[PDB]
Amino acid sequence: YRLKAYYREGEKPSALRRAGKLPGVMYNRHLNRKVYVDLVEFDKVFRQASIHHVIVLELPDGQSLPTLVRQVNLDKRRRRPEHVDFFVLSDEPVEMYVPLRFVGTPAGVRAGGVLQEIHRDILVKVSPRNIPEFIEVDVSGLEIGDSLHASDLKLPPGVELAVSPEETIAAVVPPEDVEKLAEEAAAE
Amino acid sequence: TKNGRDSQAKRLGVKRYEGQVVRAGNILVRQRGTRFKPGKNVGMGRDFTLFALVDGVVEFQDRGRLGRYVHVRPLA
Amino acid sequence: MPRLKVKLVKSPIGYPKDQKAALKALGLRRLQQERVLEDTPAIRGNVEKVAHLVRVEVV
Amino acid sequence: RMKYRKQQRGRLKGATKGGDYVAFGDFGLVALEPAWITAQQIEAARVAMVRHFRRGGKIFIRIFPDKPYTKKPLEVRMGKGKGNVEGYVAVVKPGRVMFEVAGVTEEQAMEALRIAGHKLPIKTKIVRRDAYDEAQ
RNA sequence: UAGAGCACUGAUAGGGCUAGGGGGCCCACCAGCCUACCAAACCCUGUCAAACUCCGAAGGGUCCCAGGUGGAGCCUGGGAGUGAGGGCGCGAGCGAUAACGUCCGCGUCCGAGCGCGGGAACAACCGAGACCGCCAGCUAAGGCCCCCAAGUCUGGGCUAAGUGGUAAAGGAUGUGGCGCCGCGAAGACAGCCAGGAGGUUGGCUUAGAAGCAGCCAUCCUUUAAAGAGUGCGUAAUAGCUCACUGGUCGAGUGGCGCCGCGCCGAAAAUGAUCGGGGCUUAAGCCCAGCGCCGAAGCUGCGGGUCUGGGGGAUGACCCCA
RNA sequence: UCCUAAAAGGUAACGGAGGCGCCCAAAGGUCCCCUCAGGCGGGACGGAAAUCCGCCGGAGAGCGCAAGGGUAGAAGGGGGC
RNA sequence: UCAACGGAUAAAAGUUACCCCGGGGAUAACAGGCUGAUCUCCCCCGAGCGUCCACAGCGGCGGGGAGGUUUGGCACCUCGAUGUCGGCUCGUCGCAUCCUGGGGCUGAAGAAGGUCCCAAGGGUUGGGCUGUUCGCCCAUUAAAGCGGCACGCGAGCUGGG
RNA sequence: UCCCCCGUGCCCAUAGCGGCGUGGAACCACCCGUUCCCAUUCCGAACACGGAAGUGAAACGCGCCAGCGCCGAUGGUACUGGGCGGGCGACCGCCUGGGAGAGUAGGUCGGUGCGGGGG
Ligand SMILES: [Mg+2]
Ligand SMILES: [Mg+2]
Ligand SMILES: [Mg+2]
Ligand SMILES: [Mg+2]
Ligand SMILES: [Mg+2]
Ligand SMILES: [Mg+2]
Ligand SMILES: [Mg+2]
Ligand SMILES: [Mg+2]
Ligand SMILES: [Mg+2]
Ligand SMILES: [Mg+2]
Ligand SMILES: [Mg+2]
Ligand SMILES: [Mg+2]
Ligand SMILES: [Mg+2]
Ligand SMILES: [Mg+2]
Ligand SMILES: [Mg+2]
Ligand SMILES: [Mg+2]
Ligand SMILES: [Mg+2]
Ligand SMILES: [Mg+2]
Ligand SMILES: [Mg+2]
Ligand SMILES: [Mg+2]
Ligand SMILES: [Mg+2]
Ligand SMILES: [Mg+2]
Ligand SMILES: [Mg+2]
Ligand SMILES: [Mg+2]
Ligand SMILES: [Mg+2]
Ligand SMILES: [Mg+2]
Ligand SMILES: [Mg+2]
Ligand SMILES: [Mg+2]
Ligand SMILES: [Mg+2]
Ligand SMILES: [Mg+2]
Ligand SMILES: [Mg+2]
Ligand SMILES: [Mg+2]
Ligand SMILES: [Mg+2]
Ligand SMILES: [Mg+2]
Ligand SMILES: [Mg+2]
Ligand SMILES: [Mg+2]
Ligand SMILES: [Mg+2]
Ligand SMILES: [Mg+2]
Ligand SMILES: [Mg+2]
Ligand SMILES: [Mg+2]
Ligand SMILES: [Mg+2]
Ligand SMILES: [Mg+2]
Ligand SMILES: [Mg+2]
Ligand SMILES: [Mg+2]
Ligand SMILES: [Mg+2]
Ligand SMILES: [Mg+2]
Ligand SMILES: [Mg+2]
Ligand SMILES: [Mg+2]
Ligand SMILES: [Mg+2]
Ligand SMILES: [Mg+2]
Ligand SMILES: [Mg+2]
Ligand SMILES: [Mg+2]
Ligand SMILES: [Mg+2]
Ligand SMILES: [Mg+2]
Ligand SMILES: [Mg+2]
Ligand SMILES: [Mg+2]
Ligand SMILES: [Mg+2]
Ligand SMILES: [Mg+2]
Ligand SMILES: [Mg+2]
Ligand SMILES: [Mg+2]
Ligand SMILES: [Mg+2]
Ligand SMILES: [Mg+2]
Ligand SMILES: [Mg+2]
Ligand SMILES: [Mg+2]
Ligand SMILES: [Mg+2]
Ligand SMILES: [Mg+2]
Ligand SMILES: [Mg+2]
Ligand SMILES: [Mg+2]
Ligand SMILES: [Mg+2]
Ligand SMILES: [Mg+2]
Ligand SMILES: [Mg+2]
Ligand SMILES: [Mg+2]
Ligand SMILES: [Mg+2]
Ligand SMILES: [Mg+2]
Ligand SMILES: [Mg+2]
Ligand SMILES: [Mg+2]
Ligand SMILES: [Mg+2]
Ligand SMILES: [Mg+2]
Ligand SMILES: [Mg+2]
Ligand SMILES: [Mg+2]
Ligand SMILES: [Mg+2]
Ligand SMILES: [Mg+2]
Ligand SMILES: [Mg+2]
Ligand SMILES: [Mg+2]
Ligand SMILES: [Mg+2]
Ligand SMILES: [Mg+2]
Ligand SMILES: [Mg+2]
Ligand SMILES: [Mg+2]
Ligand SMILES: [Mg+2]
Ligand SMILES: [Mg+2]
Ligand SMILES: [Mg+2]
Ligand SMILES: [Mg+2]
Ligand SMILES: [Mg+2]
Ligand SMILES: [Mg+2]
Ligand SMILES: [Mg+2]
Ligand SMILES: [Mg+2]
Ligand SMILES: [Mg+2]
Ligand SMILES: [Mg+2]
Ligand SMILES: [Mg+2]
Ligand SMILES: [Mg+2]
Ligand SMILES: [Mg+2]
Ligand SMILES: [Mg+2]
Ligand SMILES: [Mg+2]
Ligand SMILES: [Mg+2]
Ligand SMILES: [Mg+2]
Ligand SMILES: [Mg+2]
Ligand SMILES: [Mg+2]
Ligand SMILES: [Mg+2]
Ligand SMILES: [Mg+2]
Ligand SMILES: [Mg+2]
Ligand SMILES: [Mg+2]
Ligand SMILES: [Mg+2]
Ligand SMILES: [Mg+2]
Ligand SMILES: [Mg+2]
Ligand SMILES: [Mg+2]
Ligand SMILES: [Mg+2]
Ligand SMILES: [Mg+2]
Ligand SMILES: [Mg+2]
Ligand SMILES: [Mg+2]
Ligand SMILES: [Mg+2]
Ligand SMILES: [Mg+2]
Ligand SMILES: [Mg+2]
Ligand SMILES: [Mg+2]
Ligand SMILES: [Mg+2]
Ligand SMILES: [Mg+2]
Ligand SMILES: [Mg+2]
Ligand SMILES: [Mg+2]
Ligand SMILES: [Mg+2]
Ligand SMILES: [Mg+2]
Ligand SMILES: [Mg+2]
Ligand SMILES: [Mg+2]
Ligand SMILES: [Mg+2]
Ligand SMILES: [Mg+2]
Ligand SMILES: [Mg+2]
Ligand SMILES: [Mg+2]
Ligand SMILES: [Mg+2]
Ligand SMILES: [Mg+2]
Ligand SMILES: [Mg+2]
Ligand SMILES: [Mg+2]
Ligand SMILES: [Mg+2]
Ligand SMILES: [Mg+2]
Ligand SMILES: [Mg+2]
Ligand SMILES: [Mg+2]
Ligand SMILES: [Mg+2]
Ligand SMILES: [Mg+2]
Ligand SMILES: [Mg+2]
Ligand SMILES: [Mg+2]
Ligand SMILES: [Mg+2]
Ligand SMILES: [Mg+2]
Ligand SMILES: [Mg+2]
Ligand SMILES: [Mg+2]
Ligand SMILES: [Mg+2]
Ligand SMILES: [Mg+2]
Ligand SMILES: [Mg+2]
Ligand SMILES: [Mg+2]
Ligand SMILES: [Mg+2]
Ligand SMILES: [Mg+2]
Ligand SMILES: [Mg+2]
Ligand SMILES: [Mg+2]
Ligand SMILES: [Mg+2]
Ligand SMILES: [Mg+2]
Incomplete structure (x- = not known):
């Protein structure tokens, strides 16, 4: 994706938002530059892009930088993005959160279970060239009460699980209405 | 009820500060345990009271593991 | 340390004691009173902490 | 619970840490005003929620009174x-995420969270999901 | 400390791991397996704490140096009074995140400034510290249509309730304004015209269950369109409707989010009201600008008194702040 | 003793929560020496826990007695005088 | 255990409706007031009941509020005095209406009724028991309303409490 | 000047743990032995003494590697002396000066003083 990023300097970060620009900074292992983008633009761009793909930032300098939001500071008091980071890549293997597509028909659904998920995006080390839109999650033969772990992952080549090879990925917990309530009020 | 109790203020802590003139025997700092260790021309007693053994200025010196020592630099 | 004209315009009555005292080190008796002290880092401080009571003038 | 008898009052300053993000589930319920939420209130919204969509999925109750x-x-x-008369409460300041459902339909969620909102004393909002987490 | 954090001290929502306890398989040879159960220690997600703190501000205290001549300070001594305080802002306990409630703290006014202007009136809210005079002059707060001093000022928006004249969860095609997305002159929205078929009475269930009590499963054909079917309805059927397609039709149309102001929610006791009259492109609210009224504050003139400075055989008196 | 106490000190309420009215001639003084709790693994009675062995284990023990603070680079454990 | 721990004597309890003096609204009881926890009523959400159908009628779990009658909190005016129940007498005001008036819905055939809205102008009984308010009861009634006025009224009365 | 090593002190984790490598002529430790000084509530393991042979295994020195630990921006943000405004209240906002924590990029498996021995 793209985004017309501008250079900052002595602008009021607070009064800046009032205008309509989203404060933030782009930087890598050798970079550190005050910048800012447009609220409306970044809004619709980040909706799709999010923090899994790479968003090139077109500075007035004409520099097309392979950046991805390393971090977002969300304003409390009615959610809304305040600040944004933009970590630029190069040719060195970089870590990041990669999407996970839970595809299949869990045995829980059949027995009237609950679609549980934990890591909708795992942190993994990978080269800048590899941009796997997502990883096929074989969640299907998973019955109610069973769990798929990080050590049970199918990793696309050139990638490693930069986590703790035993980290929960998903589950299948039970429903809850009648039985629980009626029995809880009397057994609590 | 039964709670309204409390031993009056003992008023401890830092009595003298770095960059202060001191005679000989001035109670530098009265402390609980040993939050401040002695040092150059400074000794303590039973209640861990810190005082000057010479005449000069008070100085502090934080030394992580070792501790937060405090001394006095004699001059006249 | 060019001159510093200062005119008392906002009564200190009802304001913190320290501020009252500031108009003493600066020496401001009544209202609408002129006062052209020097521009020393010290004297500045006072004028500053009471700026909302006196309109400074760079002379 | 388990610690010791009583505790102070303490004011409810800015809606700072009282406010998070949708960490689990799909939809979420956020507070707009600050106040103490009662145990009876948690359950009230709980039962209301789960009772609405019989055989419901998983209802996450992030907050917790103490x-x-x-x-x-x-x-x-x-x-x-x-x-102890009313029991206990939780420091609920604007932005907080009291509840959040999952594995269910959006309609079930929207209506439920709505009802459970009335079980709450504070005016509330209903946030989707987005992608606002913390990554790259 | 604020905050912040969970590294200790405790709480804790979910999940994994897994000791221990329950249940089932099964033979007592005493183990082995499963468990949409209770759950220790450990890990991940996530969070709470005055008496928890890995961390940690603004700030406050203090000593040296510098400005600071002030009804500043320090020393010795004489003479006191005071030892119910209160309101207010802020930070806390108690209270019920009650009280013209109460208990400390930081400051402030009233006290003792019930002296003056404003606030309708009103010890403490806003303005401002009254030595005396004056039929002078600018301004402060507030205010500038009439009671009332001074604009029915100027320009640009909002609000049709008299809102303004000031109550909540919650409710609402009120009305205006900004952004995103669907659909549309290759013919859209709506009304309107007709159709909206079979297997199938989807499986099951049930007395029945035929799209439409309920459960679960979760096709094919014809075609421009018709759904293993949305509601009303029947005992179950029928019958109507809708999404859908074509004709009509002719220009827009639909949804979401955010914002301004108003509407409902709104029931009290001697007569009624925003202080009153009365006000609607304002005499309401928001925004930007000029002008003016207005205090015992300031300036102007004159005068008293006290303190300090100067002329000064001159004590004296004169002038100045 | 701690919190309340608003980062110096101090600071109130019939505010929250807990102690003292002692004990020790060795639990002191000096000298020299010594290092915890637990966890795991291994072992006759024991076997959650006596005692012994190996590795890990910086202070979560110990420090007479409540708590706070301090503390093994000793205030702790032992012996001589 | 001068432990009331700055310790009046070496040596000390209780009673007064037989009571008194000094003083306080620095302080309780009555009333007012501020508040609204308690009380009355209204309202949002709506599991669920009502064959069927959540809104004829009804409402869990929980949330908002109005009033200012009760109990209650505070101790602000009044302790050189604000008379305190009930009754009687005279009332007057509110509306959240008991009746009569009108109206909507109905699980409204009709009659009768249920519930909600509008609506004080007027009306809203005699008696038994108790100091009672309150309430129970008899007989009737179109109905036998709730509440404010220092729970109106002792310089109008009563004095059973 | 400079290098390797020994003693000792400072900075007090960017020097710690851990896996790998590496040095013994010199320096260091282990090592031989327990007669004498002296010792383990049992042991020469520890402390101690006399001193050749052997190794660099243990310990340590040096170097490497980042998995753990640790150090940590910047940017913005919370909060806040000070000044001001708005709401019934719970609370909210602006100007002025100050400005964390957490998370991100990232840094580090040491640096340094005096003296002593050896080239
Ligand atoms: Mg553009
Ligand atoms: Mg006390
Ligand atoms: Mg006391
Ligand atoms: Mg005290
Ligand atoms: Mg005392
Ligand atoms: Mg004053
Ligand atoms: Mg100061
Ligand atoms: Mg418990
Ligand atoms: Mg708070
Ligand atoms: Mg409750
Ligand atoms: Mg609500
Ligand atoms: Mg409540
Ligand atoms: Mg809502
Ligand atoms: Mg605090
Ligand atoms: Mg704290
Ligand atoms: Mg805090
Ligand atoms: Mg943590
Ligand atoms: Mg414990
Ligand atoms: Mg647990
Ligand atoms: Mg848990
Ligand atoms: Mg077991
Ligand atoms: Mg068992
Ligand atoms: Mg057999
Ligand atoms: Mg057996
Ligand atoms: Mg046997
Ligand atoms: Mg067997
Ligand atoms: Mg645990
Ligand atoms: Mg986190
Ligand atoms: Mg929690
Ligand atoms: Mg200073
Ligand atoms: Mg000097
Ligand atoms: Mg000098
Ligand atoms: Mg000097
Ligand atoms: Mg000086
Ligand atoms: Mg002078
Ligand atoms: Mg004076
Ligand atoms: Mg004076
Ligand atoms: Mg005197
Ligand atoms: Mg006294
Ligand atoms: Mg308070
Ligand atoms: Mg009082
Ligand atoms: Mg008071
Ligand atoms: Mg005061
Ligand atoms: Mg005065
Ligand atoms: Mg005064
Ligand atoms: Mg005064
Ligand atoms: Mg008078
Ligand atoms: Mg006035
Ligand atoms: Mg006045
Ligand atoms: Mg005059
Ligand atoms: Mg004028
Ligand atoms: Mg004005
Ligand atoms: Mg006027
Ligand atoms: Mg206009
Ligand atoms: Mg009106
Ligand atoms: Mg709509
Ligand atoms: Mg056409
Ligand atoms: Mg149409
Ligand atoms: Mg239509
Ligand atoms: Mg047929
Ligand atoms: Mg059938
Ligand atoms: Mg009415
Ligand atoms: Mg009237
Ligand atoms: Mg007015
Ligand atoms: Mg103007
Ligand atoms: Mg005037
Ligand atoms: Mg004058
Ligand atoms: Mg003049
Ligand atoms: Mg002049
Ligand atoms: Mg002379
Ligand atoms: Mg002279
Ligand atoms: Mg003279
Ligand atoms: Mg403190
Ligand atoms: Mg303090
Ligand atoms: Mg308390
Ligand atoms: Mg003894
Ligand atoms: Mg001893
Ligand atoms: Mg000893
Ligand atoms: Mg030993
Ligand atoms: Mg052990
Ligand atoms: Mg074992
Ligand atoms: Mg063992
Ligand atoms: Mg063992
Ligand atoms: Mg035996
Ligand atoms: Mg054992
Ligand atoms: Mg064992
Ligand atoms: Mg064991
Ligand atoms: Mg000792
Ligand atoms: Mg010893
Ligand atoms: Mg000894
Ligand atoms: Mg006694
Ligand atoms: Mg005596
Ligand atoms: Mg006494
Ligand atoms: Mg006595
Ligand atoms: Mg006595
Ligand atoms: Mg006695
Ligand atoms: Mg008698
Ligand atoms: Mg008599
Ligand atoms: Mg008698
Ligand atoms: Mg008397
Ligand atoms: Mg009374
Ligand atoms: Mg009273
Ligand atoms: Mg009165
Ligand atoms: Mg109330
Ligand atoms: Mg209502
Ligand atoms: Mg009702
Ligand atoms: Mg009920
Ligand atoms: Mg119940
Ligand atoms: Mg209940
Ligand atoms: Mg209720
Ligand atoms: Mg409630
Ligand atoms: Mg209520
Ligand atoms: Mg209320
Ligand atoms: Mg009362
Ligand atoms: Mg009083
Ligand atoms: Mg009297
Ligand atoms: Mg009189
Ligand atoms: Mg009288
Ligand atoms: Mg009188
Ligand atoms: Mg009459
Ligand atoms: Mg009728
Ligand atoms: Mg009717
Ligand atoms: Mg009819
Ligand atoms: Mg009938
Ligand atoms: Mg009449
Ligand atoms: Mg009678
Ligand atoms: Mg009779
Ligand atoms: Mg009779
Ligand atoms: Mg009678
Ligand atoms: Mg009677
Ligand atoms: Mg009765
Ligand atoms: Mg009868
Ligand atoms: Mg009456
Ligand atoms: Mg009466
Ligand atoms: Mg009477
Ligand atoms: Mg009478
Ligand atoms: Mg009477
Ligand atoms: Mg009378
Ligand atoms: Mg008589
Ligand atoms: Mg009698
Ligand atoms: Mg009698
Ligand atoms: Mg080797
Ligand atoms: Mg080698
Ligand atoms: Mg021997
Ligand atoms: Mg020999
Ligand atoms: Mg011998
Ligand atoms: Mg031997
Ligand atoms: Mg040896
Ligand atoms: Mg020999
Ligand atoms: Mg050799
Ligand atoms: Mg060798
Ligand atoms: Mg080696
Ligand atoms: Mg070395
Ligand atoms: Mg950091
Ligand atoms: Mg940082
Ligand atoms: Mg990195
Ligand atoms: Mg890192
Ligand atoms: Mg190394
Ligand atoms: Mg060196
Ligand atoms: Mg050489
Ligand atoms: Mg050479």
């Missing part, structure tokens, strides 16, 4: 209150 609600039994000033 503040001994103090109170006196219609008398005067002989020491500190017995409290």
